[PDB]
């Protein structure tokens, strides 16, 4: 059962409920959903993993300005914190517009 994955659907039954891996993709899937309400939560939890798969989402999202989908990407950075996302805000700082800008600029204050 691999030494890197001991937990799996243990007492769980949903997707994002508790997987820490198996829900990573279903999470990435919502990024293509036509609905903004669902696409939001995805971006909101995507940063909680601190992975490259969460880096891109914030890039496009912070530009979507779809509110839940956009604002969600912003908070994702602060969640990760580090040089990784430090490049994400740098990419948004180049296209910094409105609130989307304050996101990158103010965020880097904590790396």
């Amino acid at each position: 059962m691999a030494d890197e994955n001991k937990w799996v659907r243990r007492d769980v039954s949903t997707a994002l409920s508790r997987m820490g891996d198996e829900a990573f993709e279903p999470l990435l899937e919502s990024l293509s959903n036509e609905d903004w309400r669902i696409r939001g939560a995805a971006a909101w939890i995507i940063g909680n993993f601190q992975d490259e798969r969460a880096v891109e989402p914030l890039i496009k999202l912070l530009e979507d300005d779809s509110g839940f989908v956009r604002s969600g990407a912003a908070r994702s950075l602060e969640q990760i914190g580090g040089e990784r996302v430090r490049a994400a805000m740098e990419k948004l700082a180049e296209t910094g517009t409105g609130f989307a800008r304050k996101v990158a600029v103010n965020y880097l204050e904590t790396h």
Side-chain angles (χ1 to χ4, degrees):
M1 295 70 60
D3 300 90
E4 285 64 80
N5 178 272
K6 215 296 188 300
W7 39 52
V8 51
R9 303 179 178 191
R10 49 174 59 185
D11 188 85
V12 197
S13 183
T14 332
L16 74 319
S17 179
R18 185 183 179 205
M19 295 303 179
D21 175 272
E22 296 297 275
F24 205 47
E25 266 180 85
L27 141 73
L28 165 73
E29 195 288 293
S30 298
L31 300 182
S32 180
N33 191 213
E34 303 184 272
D35 303 284
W36 60 275
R37 177 175 176 194
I38 303 178
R39 177 177 54 185
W44 276 62
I45 309 176
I46 211 157
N48 305 152
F49 286 74
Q50 287 81 213
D51 193 85
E52 63 180 90
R53 180 122 46 231
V55 177
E56 188 198 80
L58 324 182
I59 300 297
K60 52 149 70 64
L61 269 33
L62 295 161
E63 230 298 284
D64 280 283
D65 189 69
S66 279
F68 209 153
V69 188
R70 198 267 304 248
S71 301
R75 67 180 322 115
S76 303
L77 289 85
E78 297 184 298
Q79 295 153 209
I80 305 184
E83 65 181 87
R84 346 79 163 89
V85 247
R86 195 185 62 191
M89 69 74 178
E90 283 181 279
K91 190 70 189 58
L92 141 70
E94 190 181 277
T95 56
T97 173
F99 165 81
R101 181 148 54 181
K102 173 179 167 182
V103 166
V105 182
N106 180 33
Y107 161 67
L108 61 89
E109 190 183 78
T110 345
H111 305 270

mmCIF file with all atom_site columns, all heavy atoms in Angstrom, residues 70-95:
data_model
loop_
_atom_site.group_PDB
_atom_site.id
_atom_site.type_symbol
_atom_site.label_atom_id
_atom_site.label_alt_id
_atom_site.label_comp_id
_atom_site.label_asym_id
_atom_site.label_entity_id
_atom_site.label_seq_id
_atom_site.pdbx_PDB_ins_code
_atom_site.Cartn_x
_atom_site.Cartn_y
_atom_site.Cartn_z
_atom_site.occupancy
_atom_site.B_iso_or_equiv
_atom_site.pdbx_formal_charge
_atom_site.auth_seq_id
_atom_site.auth_comp_id
_atom_site.auth_asym_id
_atom_site.auth_atom_id
_atom_site.pdbx_PDB_model_num
ATOM 1   N N   . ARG A 1 70 ? -11.337 34.810 -8.060  1.00 0.00 ? 70 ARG A N   1
ATOM 2   C CA  . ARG A 1 70 ? -10.181 35.707 -8.043  1.00 0.00 ? 70 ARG A CA  1
ATOM 3   C C   . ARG A 1 70 ? -9.648  35.904 -6.623  1.00 0.00 ? 70 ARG A C   1
ATOM 4   O O   . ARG A 1 70 ? -8.513  35.532 -6.321  1.00 0.00 ? 70 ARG A O   1
ATOM 5   C CB  . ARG A 1 70 ? -10.557 37.058 -8.656  1.00 0.00 ? 70 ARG A CB  1
ATOM 6   C CG  . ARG A 1 70 ? -9.360  37.898 -9.070  1.00 0.00 ? 70 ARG A CG  1
ATOM 7   C CD  . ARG A 1 70 ? -8.937  38.853 -7.969  1.00 0.00 ? 70 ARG A CD  1
ATOM 8   N NE  . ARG A 1 70 ? -10.033 39.723 -7.549  1.00 0.00 ? 70 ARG A NE  1
ATOM 9   C CZ  . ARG A 1 70 ? -10.056 41.037 -7.761  1.00 0.00 ? 70 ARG A CZ  1
ATOM 10  N NH1 . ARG A 1 70 ? -9.047  41.632 -8.385  1.00 0.00 ? 70 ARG A NH1 1
ATOM 11  N NH2 . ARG A 1 70 ? -11.091 41.757 -7.350  1.00 0.00 ? 70 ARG A NH2 1
ATOM 12  N N   . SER A 1 71 ? -10.472 36.495 -5.761  1.00 0.00 ? 71 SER A N   1
ATOM 13  C CA  . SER A 1 71 ? -10.091 36.740 -4.370  1.00 0.00 ? 71 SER A CA  1
ATOM 14  C C   . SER A 1 71 ? -9.571  35.471 -3.706  1.00 0.00 ? 71 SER A C   1
ATOM 15  O O   . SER A 1 71 ? -8.701  35.525 -2.836  1.00 0.00 ? 71 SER A O   1
ATOM 16  C CB  . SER A 1 71 ? -11.284 37.284 -3.583  1.00 0.00 ? 71 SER A CB  1
ATOM 17  O OG  . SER A 1 71 ? -11.755 38.497 -4.147  1.00 0.00 ? 71 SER A OG  1
ATOM 18  N N   . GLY A 1 72 ? -10.109 34.329 -4.122  1.00 0.00 ? 72 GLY A N   1
ATOM 19  C CA  . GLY A 1 72 ? -9.682  33.064 -3.559  1.00 0.00 ? 72 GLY A CA  1
ATOM 20  C C   . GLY A 1 72 ? -8.227  32.766 -3.844  1.00 0.00 ? 72 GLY A C   1
ATOM 21  O O   . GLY A 1 72 ? -7.517  32.227 -2.995  1.00 0.00 ? 72 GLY A O   1
ATOM 22  N N   . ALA A 1 73 ? -7.786  33.114 -5.043  1.00 0.00 ? 73 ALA A N   1
ATOM 23  C CA  . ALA A 1 73 ? -6.406  32.886 -5.441  1.00 0.00 ? 73 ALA A CA  1
ATOM 24  C C   . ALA A 1 73 ? -5.449  33.700 -4.582  1.00 0.00 ? 73 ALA A C   1
ATOM 25  O O   . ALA A 1 73 ? -4.368  33.232 -4.232  1.00 0.00 ? 73 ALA A O   1
ATOM 26  C CB  . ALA A 1 73 ? -6.222  33.237 -6.905  1.00 0.00 ? 73 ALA A CB  1
ATOM 27  N N   . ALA A 1 74 ? -5.859  34.917 -4.238  1.00 0.00 ? 74 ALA A N   1
ATOM 28  C CA  . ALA A 1 74 ? -5.033  35.808 -3.432  1.00 0.00 ? 74 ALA A CA  1
ATOM 29  C C   . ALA A 1 74 ? -4.669  35.183 -2.089  1.00 0.00 ? 74 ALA A C   1
ATOM 30  O O   . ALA A 1 74 ? -3.490  35.045 -1.757  1.00 0.00 ? 74 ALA A O   1
ATOM 31  C CB  . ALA A 1 74 ? -5.749  37.132 -3.218  1.00 0.00 ? 74 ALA A CB  1
ATOM 32  N N   . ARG A 1 75 ? -5.685  34.806 -1.321  1.00 0.00 ? 75 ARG A N   1
ATOM 33  C CA  . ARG A 1 75 ? -5.476  34.209 -0.006  1.00 0.00 ? 75 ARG A CA  1
ATOM 34  C C   . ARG A 1 75 ? -4.637  32.935 -0.094  1.00 0.00 ? 75 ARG A C   1
ATOM 35  O O   . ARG A 1 75 ? -3.956  32.568 0.862   1.00 0.00 ? 75 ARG A O   1
ATOM 36  C CB  . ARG A 1 75 ? -6.820  33.901 0.656   1.00 0.00 ? 75 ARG A CB  1
ATOM 37  C CG  . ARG A 1 75 ? -7.612  32.812 -0.048  1.00 0.00 ? 75 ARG A CG  1
ATOM 38  C CD  . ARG A 1 75 ? -8.932  32.539 0.655   1.00 0.00 ? 75 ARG A CD  1
ATOM 39  N NE  . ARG A 1 75 ? -8.800  32.612 2.109   1.00 0.00 ? 75 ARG A NE  1
ATOM 40  C CZ  . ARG A 1 75 ? -9.399  33.531 2.860   1.00 0.00 ? 75 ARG A CZ  1
ATOM 41  N NH1 . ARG A 1 75 ? -10.182 34.445 2.300   1.00 0.00 ? 75 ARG A NH1 1
ATOM 42  N NH2 . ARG A 1 75 ? -9.218  33.536 4.174   1.00 0.00 ? 75 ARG A NH2 1
ATOM 43  N N   . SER A 1 76 ? -4.692  32.264 -1.241  1.00 0.00 ? 76 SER A N   1
ATOM 44  C CA  . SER A 1 76 ? -3.940  31.028 -1.437  1.00 0.00 ? 76 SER A CA  1
ATOM 45  C C   . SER A 1 76 ? -2.443  31.249 -1.242  1.00 0.00 ? 76 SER A C   1
ATOM 46  O O   . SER A 1 76 ? -1.757  30.409 -0.662  1.00 0.00 ? 76 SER A O   1
ATOM 47  C CB  . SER A 1 76 ? -4.205  30.459 -2.830  1.00 0.00 ? 76 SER A CB  1
ATOM 48  O OG  . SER A 1 76 ? -5.590  30.245 -3.037  1.00 0.00 ? 76 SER A OG  1
ATOM 49  N N   . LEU A 1 77 ? -1.937  32.380 -1.728  1.00 0.00 ? 77 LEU A N   1
ATOM 50  C CA  . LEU A 1 77 ? -0.517  32.694 -1.593  1.00 0.00 ? 77 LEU A CA  1
ATOM 51  C C   . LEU A 1 77 ? -0.117  32.753 -0.123  1.00 0.00 ? 77 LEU A C   1
ATOM 52  O O   . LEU A 1 77 ? 0.771   32.023 0.317   1.00 0.00 ? 77 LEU A O   1
ATOM 53  C CB  . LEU A 1 77 ? -0.182  34.019 -2.284  1.00 0.00 ? 77 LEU A CB  1
ATOM 54  C CG  . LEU A 1 77 ? -0.216  33.979 -3.812  1.00 0.00 ? 77 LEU A CG  1
ATOM 55  C CD1 . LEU A 1 77 ? -1.627  34.208 -4.321  1.00 0.00 ? 77 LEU A CD1 1
ATOM 56  C CD2 . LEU A 1 77 ? 0.738   35.008 -4.398  1.00 0.00 ? 77 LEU A CD2 1
ATOM 57  N N   . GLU A 1 78 ? -0.776  33.632 0.625   1.00 0.00 ? 78 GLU A N   1
ATOM 58  C CA  . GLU A 1 78 ? -0.508  33.788 2.053   1.00 0.00 ? 78 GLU A CA  1
ATOM 59  C C   . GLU A 1 78 ? -0.496  32.439 2.767   1.00 0.00 ? 78 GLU A C   1
ATOM 60  O O   . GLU A 1 78 ? 0.222   32.251 3.749   1.00 0.00 ? 78 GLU A O   1
ATOM 61  C CB  . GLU A 1 78 ? -1.557  34.703 2.686   1.00 0.00 ? 78 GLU A CB  1
ATOM 62  C CG  . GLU A 1 78 ? -1.536  36.118 2.139   1.00 0.00 ? 78 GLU A CG  1
ATOM 63  C CD  . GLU A 1 78 ? -2.523  37.030 2.841   1.00 0.00 ? 78 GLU A CD  1
ATOM 64  O OE1 . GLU A 1 78 ? -3.740  36.754 2.772   1.00 0.00 ? 78 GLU A OE1 1
ATOM 65  O OE2 . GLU A 1 78 ? -2.080  38.018 3.465   1.00 0.00 ? 78 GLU A OE2 1
ATOM 66  N N   . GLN A 1 79 ? -1.294  31.503 2.265   1.00 0.00 ? 79 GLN A N   1
ATOM 67  C CA  . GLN A 1 79 ? -1.377  30.169 2.851   1.00 0.00 ? 79 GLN A CA  1
ATOM 68  C C   . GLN A 1 79 ? -0.082  29.393 2.638   1.00 0.00 ? 79 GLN A C   1
ATOM 69  O O   . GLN A 1 79 ? 0.399   28.708 3.542   1.00 0.00 ? 79 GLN A O   1
ATOM 70  C CB  . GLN A 1 79 ? -2.549  29.399 2.246   1.00 0.00 ? 79 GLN A CB  1
ATOM 71  C CG  . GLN A 1 79 ? -3.904  29.997 2.581   1.00 0.00 ? 79 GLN A CG  1
ATOM 72  C CD  . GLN A 1 79 ? -4.957  29.689 1.535   1.00 0.00 ? 79 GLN A CD  1
ATOM 73  O OE1 . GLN A 1 79 ? -5.891  30.463 1.331   1.00 0.00 ? 79 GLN A OE1 1
ATOM 74  N NE2 . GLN A 1 79 ? -4.810  28.553 0.859   1.00 0.00 ? 79 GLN A NE2 1
ATOM 75  N N   . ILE A 1 80 ? 0.478   29.504 1.438   1.00 0.00 ? 80 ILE A N   1
ATOM 76  C CA  . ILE A 1 80 ? 1.716   28.810 1.108   1.00 0.00 ? 80 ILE A CA  1
ATOM 77  C C   . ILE A 1 80 ? 2.912   29.482 1.775   1.00 0.00 ? 80 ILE A C   1
ATOM 78  O O   . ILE A 1 80 ? 3.603   28.868 2.588   1.00 0.00 ? 80 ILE A O   1
ATOM 79  C CB  . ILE A 1 80 ? 1.942   28.765 -0.418  1.00 0.00 ? 80 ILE A CB  1
ATOM 80  C CG1 . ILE A 1 80 ? 0.725   28.140 -1.110  1.00 0.00 ? 80 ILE A CG1 1
ATOM 81  C CG2 . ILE A 1 80 ? 3.214   27.992 -0.746  1.00 0.00 ? 80 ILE A CG2 1
ATOM 82  C CD1 . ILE A 1 80 ? 0.891   27.967 -2.606  1.00 0.00 ? 80 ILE A CD1 1
ATOM 83  N N   . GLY A 1 81 ? 3.139   30.748 1.435   1.00 0.00 ? 81 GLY A N   1
ATOM 84  C CA  . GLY A 1 81 ? 4.245   31.490 2.014   1.00 0.00 ? 81 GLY A CA  1
ATOM 85  C C   . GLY A 1 81 ? 5.600   30.905 1.663   1.00 0.00 ? 81 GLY A C   1
ATOM 86  O O   . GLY A 1 81 ? 5.906   29.769 2.024   1.00 0.00 ? 81 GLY A O   1
ATOM 87  N N   . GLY A 1 82 ? 6.415   31.683 0.959   1.00 0.00 ? 82 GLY A N   1
ATOM 88  C CA  . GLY A 1 82 ? 7.735   31.217 0.579   1.00 0.00 ? 82 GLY A CA  1
ATOM 89  C C   . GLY A 1 82 ? 8.172   31.733 -0.775  1.00 0.00 ? 82 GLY A C   1
ATOM 90  O O   . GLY A 1 82 ? 7.495   32.565 -1.378  1.00 0.00 ? 82 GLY A O   1
ATOM 91  N N   . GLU A 1 83 ? 9.307   31.235 -1.255  1.00 0.00 ? 83 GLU A N   1
ATOM 92  C CA  . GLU A 1 83 ? 9.841   31.647 -2.547  1.00 0.00 ? 83 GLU A CA  1
ATOM 93  C C   . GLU A 1 83 ? 8.970   31.128 -3.686  1.00 0.00 ? 83 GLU A C   1
ATOM 94  O O   . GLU A 1 83 ? 8.880   31.750 -4.745  1.00 0.00 ? 83 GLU A O   1
ATOM 95  C CB  . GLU A 1 83 ? 11.277  31.144 -2.714  1.00 0.00 ? 83 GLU A CB  1
ATOM 96  C CG  . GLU A 1 83 ? 11.391  29.629 -2.774  1.00 0.00 ? 83 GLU A CG  1
ATOM 97  C CD  . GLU A 1 83 ? 12.824  29.156 -2.914  1.00 0.00 ? 83 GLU A CD  1
ATOM 98  O OE1 . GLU A 1 83 ? 13.500  28.993 -1.877  1.00 0.00 ? 83 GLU A OE1 1
ATOM 99  O OE2 . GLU A 1 83 ? 13.271  28.949 -4.062  1.00 0.00 ? 83 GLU A OE2 1
ATOM 100 N N   . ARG A 1 84 ? 8.336   29.980 -3.460  1.00 0.00 ? 84 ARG A N   1
ATOM 101 C CA  . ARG A 1 84 ? 7.469   29.369 -4.464  1.00 0.00 ? 84 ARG A CA  1
ATOM 102 C C   . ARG A 1 84 ? 6.426   30.363 -4.955  1.00 0.00 ? 84 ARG A C   1
ATOM 103 O O   . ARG A 1 84 ? 6.403   30.731 -6.131  1.00 0.00 ? 84 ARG A O   1
ATOM 104 C CB  . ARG A 1 84 ? 6.752   28.127 -3.905  1.00 0.00 ? 84 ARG A CB  1
ATOM 105 C CG  . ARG A 1 84 ? 7.319   27.584 -2.596  1.00 0.00 ? 84 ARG A CG  1
ATOM 106 C CD  . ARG A 1 84 ? 6.852   28.390 -1.389  1.00 0.00 ? 84 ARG A CD  1
ATOM 107 N NE  . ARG A 1 84 ? 7.051   27.661 -0.137  1.00 0.00 ? 84 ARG A NE  1
ATOM 108 C CZ  . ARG A 1 84 ? 8.170   27.712 0.581   1.00 0.00 ? 84 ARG A CZ  1
ATOM 109 N NH1 . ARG A 1 84 ? 9.194   28.450 0.173   1.00 0.00 ? 84 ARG A NH1 1
ATOM 110 N NH2 . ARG A 1 84 ? 8.266   27.023 1.711   1.00 0.00 ? 84 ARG A NH2 1
ATOM 111 N N   . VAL A 1 85 ? 5.567   30.795 -4.042  1.00 0.00 ? 85 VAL A N   1
ATOM 112 C CA  . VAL A 1 85 ? 4.516   31.752 -4.366  1.00 0.00 ? 85 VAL A CA  1
ATOM 113 C C   . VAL A 1 85 ? 5.101   33.133 -4.626  1.00 0.00 ? 85 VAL A C   1
ATOM 114 O O   . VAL A 1 85 ? 4.467   33.976 -5.260  1.00 0.00 ? 85 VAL A O   1
ATOM 115 C CB  . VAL A 1 85 ? 3.457   31.853 -3.251  1.00 0.00 ? 85 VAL A CB  1
ATOM 116 C CG1 . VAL A 1 85 ? 2.126   31.302 -3.735  1.00 0.00 ? 85 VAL A CG1 1
ATOM 117 C CG2 . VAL A 1 85 ? 3.913   31.123 -1.996  1.00 0.00 ? 85 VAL A CG2 1
ATOM 118 N N   . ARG A 1 86 ? 6.311   33.360 -4.126  1.00 0.00 ? 86 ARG A N   1
ATOM 119 C CA  . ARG A 1 86 ? 6.980   34.643 -4.304  1.00 0.00 ? 86 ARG A CA  1
ATOM 120 C C   . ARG A 1 86 ? 7.100   34.973 -5.787  1.00 0.00 ? 86 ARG A C   1
ATOM 121 O O   . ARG A 1 86 ? 7.169   36.139 -6.169  1.00 0.00 ? 86 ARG A O   1
ATOM 122 C CB  . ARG A 1 86 ? 8.367   34.621 -3.659  1.00 0.00 ? 86 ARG A CB  1
ATOM 123 C CG  . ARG A 1 86 ? 8.980   36.002 -3.488  1.00 0.00 ? 86 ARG A CG  1
ATOM 124 C CD  . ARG A 1 86 ? 10.406  35.919 -2.969  1.00 0.00 ? 86 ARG A CD  1
ATOM 125 N NE  . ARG A 1 86 ? 11.290  35.216 -3.895  1.00 0.00 ? 86 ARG A NE  1
ATOM 126 C CZ  . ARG A 1 86 ? 12.525  34.829 -3.588  1.00 0.00 ? 86 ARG A CZ  1
ATOM 127 N NH1 . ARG A 1 86 ? 13.020  35.076 -2.383  1.00 0.00 ? 86 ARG A NH1 1
ATOM 128 N NH2 . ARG A 1 86 ? 13.266  34.194 -4.486  1.00 0.00 ? 86 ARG A NH2 1
ATOM 129 N N   . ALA A 1 87 ? 7.122   33.933 -6.615  1.00 0.00 ? 87 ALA A N   1
ATOM 130 C CA  . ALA A 1 87 ? 7.223   34.103 -8.056  1.00 0.00 ? 87 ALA A CA  1
ATOM 131 C C   . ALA A 1 87 ? 5.843   34.329 -8.658  1.00 0.00 ? 87 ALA A C   1
ATOM 132 O O   . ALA A 1 87 ? 5.703   34.938 -9.719  1.00 0.00 ? 87 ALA A O   1
ATOM 133 C CB  . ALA A 1 87 ? 7.887   32.886 -8.687  1.00 0.00 ? 87 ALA A CB  1
ATOM 134 N N   . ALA A 1 88 ? 4.824   33.826 -7.965  1.00 0.00 ? 88 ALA A N   1
ATOM 135 C CA  . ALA A 1 88 ? 3.448   33.972 -8.407  1.00 0.00 ? 88 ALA A CA  1
ATOM 136 C C   . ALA A 1 88 ? 3.004   35.425 -8.312  1.00 0.00 ? 88 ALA A C   1
ATOM 137 O O   . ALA A 1 88 ? 2.411   35.962 -9.246  1.00 0.00 ? 88 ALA A O   1
ATOM 138 C CB  . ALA A 1 88 ? 2.532   33.081 -7.580  1.00 0.00 ? 88 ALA A CB  1
ATOM 139 N N   . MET A 1 89 ? 3.297   36.059 -7.178  1.00 0.00 ? 89 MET A N   1
ATOM 140 C CA  . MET A 1 89 ? 2.928   37.452 -6.979  1.00 0.00 ? 89 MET A CA  1
ATOM 141 C C   . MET A 1 89 ? 3.755   38.350 -7.888  1.00 0.00 ? 89 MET A C   1
ATOM 142 O O   . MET A 1 89 ? 3.326   39.443 -8.251  1.00 0.00 ? 89 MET A O   1
ATOM 143 C CB  . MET A 1 89 ? 3.082   37.866 -5.509  1.00 0.00 ? 89 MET A CB  1
ATOM 144 C CG  . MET A 1 89 ? 4.513   37.931 -5.000  1.00 0.00 ? 89 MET A CG  1
ATOM 145 S SD  . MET A 1 89 ? 5.428   39.359 -5.616  1.00 0.00 ? 89 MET A SD  1
ATOM 146 C CE  . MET A 1 89 ? 6.999   39.142 -4.785  1.00 0.00 ? 89 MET A CE  1
ATOM 147 N N   . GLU A 1 90 ? 4.950   37.887 -8.246  1.00 0.00 ? 90 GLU A N   1
ATOM 148 C CA  . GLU A 1 90 ? 5.819   38.646 -9.136  1.00 0.00 ? 90 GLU A CA  1
ATOM 149 C C   . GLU A 1 90 ? 5.227   38.658 -10.535 1.00 0.00 ? 90 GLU A C   1
ATOM 150 O O   . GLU A 1 90 ? 5.381   39.623 -11.283 1.00 0.00 ? 90 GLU A O   1
ATOM 151 C CB  . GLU A 1 90 ? 7.229   38.051 -9.164  1.00 0.00 ? 90 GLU A CB  1
ATOM 152 C CG  . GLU A 1 90 ? 8.061   38.396 -7.941  1.00 0.00 ? 90 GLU A CG  1
ATOM 153 C CD  . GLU A 1 90 ? 9.459   37.815 -7.998  1.00 0.00 ? 90 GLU A CD  1
ATOM 154 O OE1 . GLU A 1 90 ? 9.618   36.616 -7.681  1.00 0.00 ? 90 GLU A OE1 1
ATOM 155 O OE2 . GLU A 1 90 ? 10.396  38.555 -8.362  1.00 0.00 ? 90 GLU A OE2 1
ATOM 156 N N   . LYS A 1 91 ? 4.543   37.569 -10.879 1.00 0.00 ? 91 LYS A N   1
ATOM 157 C CA  . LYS A 1 91 ? 3.904   37.447 -12.183 1.00 0.00 ? 91 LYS A CA  1
ATOM 158 C C   . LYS A 1 91 ? 2.620   38.264 -12.229 1.00 0.00 ? 91 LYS A C   1
ATOM 159 O O   . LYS A 1 91 ? 2.213   38.736 -13.293 1.00 0.00 ? 91 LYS A O   1
ATOM 160 C CB  . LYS A 1 91 ? 3.602   35.982 -12.499 1.00 0.00 ? 91 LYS A CB  1
ATOM 161 C CG  . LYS A 1 91 ? 3.162   35.747 -13.935 1.00 0.00 ? 91 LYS A CG  1
ATOM 162 C CD  . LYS A 1 91 ? 4.310   35.955 -14.911 1.00 0.00 ? 91 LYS A CD  1
ATOM 163 C CE  . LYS A 1 91 ? 3.824   35.939 -16.351 1.00 0.00 ? 91 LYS A CE  1
ATOM 164 N NZ  . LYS A 1 91 ? 2.785   36.977 -16.596 1.00 0.00 ? 91 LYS A NZ  1
ATOM 165 N N   . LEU A 1 92 ? 1.983   38.432 -11.073 1.00 0.00 ? 92 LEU A N   1
ATOM 166 C CA  . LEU A 1 92 ? 0.756   39.199 -10.990 1.00 0.00 ? 92 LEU A CA  1
ATOM 167 C C   . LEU A 1 92 ? 1.090   40.681 -10.851 1.00 0.00 ? 92 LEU A C   1
ATOM 168 O O   . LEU A 1 92 ? 0.344   41.544 -11.307 1.00 0.00 ? 92 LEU A O   1
ATOM 169 C CB  . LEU A 1 92 ? -0.090  38.704 -9.810  1.00 0.00 ? 92 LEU A CB  1
ATOM 170 C CG  . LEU A 1 92 ? -0.814  39.788 -9.013  1.00 0.00 ? 92 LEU A CG  1
ATOM 171 C CD1 . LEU A 1 92 ? -1.950  40.390 -9.827  1.00 0.00 ? 92 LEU A CD1 1
ATOM 172 C CD2 . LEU A 1 92 ? -1.341  39.224 -7.703  1.00 0.00 ? 92 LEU A CD2 1
ATOM 173 N N   . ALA A 1 93 ? 2.232   40.960 -10.229 1.00 0.00 ? 93 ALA A N   1
ATOM 174 C CA  . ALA A 1 93 ? 2.684   42.330 -10.035 1.00 0.00 ? 93 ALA A CA  1
ATOM 175 C C   . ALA A 1 93 ? 2.972   42.987 -11.379 1.00 0.00 ? 93 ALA A C   1
ATOM 176 O O   . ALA A 1 93 ? 3.004   44.213 -11.490 1.00 0.00 ? 93 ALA A O   1
ATOM 177 C CB  . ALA A 1 93 ? 3.920   42.357 -9.149  1.00 0.00 ? 93 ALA A CB  1
ATOM 178 N N   . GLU A 1 94 ? 3.182   42.159 -12.401 1.00 0.00 ? 94 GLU A N   1
ATOM 179 C CA  . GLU A 1 94 ? 3.453   42.654 -13.745 1.00 0.00 ? 94 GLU A CA  1
ATOM 180 C C   . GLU A 1 94 ? 2.145   43.049 -14.418 1.00 0.00 ? 94 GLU A C   1
ATOM 181 O O   . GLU A 1 94 ? 2.118   43.907 -15.302 1.00 0.00 ? 94 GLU A O   1
ATOM 182 C CB  . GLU A 1 94 ? 4.174   41.588 -14.573 1.00 0.00 ? 94 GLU A CB  1
ATOM 183 C CG  . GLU A 1 94 ? 4.712   42.109 -15.896 1.00 0.00 ? 94 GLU A CG  1
ATOM 184 C CD  . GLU A 1 94 ? 5.402   41.030 -16.710 1.00 0.00 ? 94 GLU A CD  1
ATOM 185 O OE1 . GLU A 1 94 ? 6.595   40.760 -16.449 1.00 0.00 ? 94 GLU A OE1 1
ATOM 186 O OE2 . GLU A 1 94 ? 4.751   40.458 -17.609 1.00 0.00 ? 94 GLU A OE2 1
ATOM 187 N N   . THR A 1 95 ? 1.061   42.409 -13.988 1.00 0.00 ? 95 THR A N   1
ATOM 188 C CA  . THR A 1 95 ? -0.266  42.691 -14.515 1.00 0.00 ? 95 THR A CA  1
ATOM 189 C C   . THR A 1 95 ? -1.167  43.204 -13.398 1.00 0.00 ? 95 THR A C   1
ATOM 190 O O   . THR A 1 95 ? -2.392  43.097 -13.467 1.00 0.00 ? 95 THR A O   1
ATOM 191 C CB  . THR A 1 95 ? -0.905  41.437 -15.142 1.00 0.00 ? 95 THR A CB  1
ATOM 192 O OG1 . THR A 1 95 ? -0.938  40.372 -14.185 1.00 0.00 ? 95 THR A OG1 1
ATOM 193 C CG2 . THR A 1 95 ? -0.132  40.993 -16.375 1.00 0.00 ? 95 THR A CG2 1
#
